[PDB]
Amino acid sequence: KIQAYFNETADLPCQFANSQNQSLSELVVFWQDQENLVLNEVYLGKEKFDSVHSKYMGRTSFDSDSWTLRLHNLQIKDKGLYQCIIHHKKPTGMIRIHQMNSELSV
């Protein structure tokens, strides 16, 4: 498990090894709270904000080269663990390939 530091900027990495070495162009990359609210969404390289909850609306950033969510302006309430989920979109069916759970203490 990976934790983050105090109220400046939290880093939430998925740490995908990418063993099959597929591209991000067909990959669904997203994060989620312990109370099971979606943080950010990536569908095919474009961020989608419809499933993002209003309490995390317009307050998170995504970096594709480092595969990391940057969580700005931390509050006292968000001390729970955050899990990032990586699905592989196929027209036959959407396959979850990677999940990881990290922590956040401020």
Partner: protein, 201 residues
């Protein structure tokens, strides 16, 4: 010295929480019906097998190369037409991940031939593969959490029985597939959920 599987008995008093199956369906099931689920167990040539008939579905789930046999199952219906399945074997005598093969067939509503047959990886530790195959178009999504660290609180264990579950993250495994354009939604609401223990074995 080699640990072996205990000999089969009529009633099993020690249960190990092995799996957490939340297969979703696009048809309506309103509530958990008492005495609906019927379970048939098998252990032939070191492969556990369970067949679950209930709530319009047959679940033929088998585990390869194990010293565990399925001894119990509890089925419940959550909100948004979600079918939670809890599975219990004897005991964990090994600390390795096991290969899983689950066949989900529709016996009501959208019956049909095989729509899906694939290998679902471990979401965590990438150490095993689930051979999933779905005989029907009636399944929204599949979520199988092998060896969970937490029991669902709405499941009331019997008084004369004993329950053990995994406490280490290293033995957790997650398999998931969705066939509709929604993130997750295999997970339940767990606000009003009730469980029924399957009939046979």
């Amino acid at each position: 010295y080699k640990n072996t599987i205990c000999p089969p008995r009529q009633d099993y008093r020690y249960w190990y929480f092995v799996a957490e199956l939340t297969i979703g369906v696009n048809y309506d099931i309103n509530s958990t019906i008492i005495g609906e689920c019927h379970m048939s167990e098998s252990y032939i040539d070191r492969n556990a097998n369970i067949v679950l008939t209930g709530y319009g579905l047959k679940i033929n789930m088998t585990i390869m190369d194990t010293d565990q046999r399925f001894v119990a199952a509890a089925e419940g219906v959550g909100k948004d037409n979600k079918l939670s399945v809890l599975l219990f074997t004897t005991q964990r005598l090994d600390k390795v991940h096991h290969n899983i093969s689950v066949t989900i067939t529709c016996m009501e509503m959208n019956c049909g031939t095989t729509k899906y047959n694939s290998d679902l990886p471990e979401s965590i530790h990438k150490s095993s593969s689930c051979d999933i195959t779905i005989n029907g178009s009636c399944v929204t999504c599949v979520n199988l959490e092998t060896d969970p660290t937490k029991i669902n609180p709405h499941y009331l264990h019997p008084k004369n029985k004993y329950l053990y579950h995994n406490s280490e993250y290293s033995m957790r495994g997650s398999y998931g597939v969705t066939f509709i354009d929604e993130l997750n939604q295999c997970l339940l609401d767990i606000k009003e959920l009730s469980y029924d223990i399957c009939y046979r074995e």
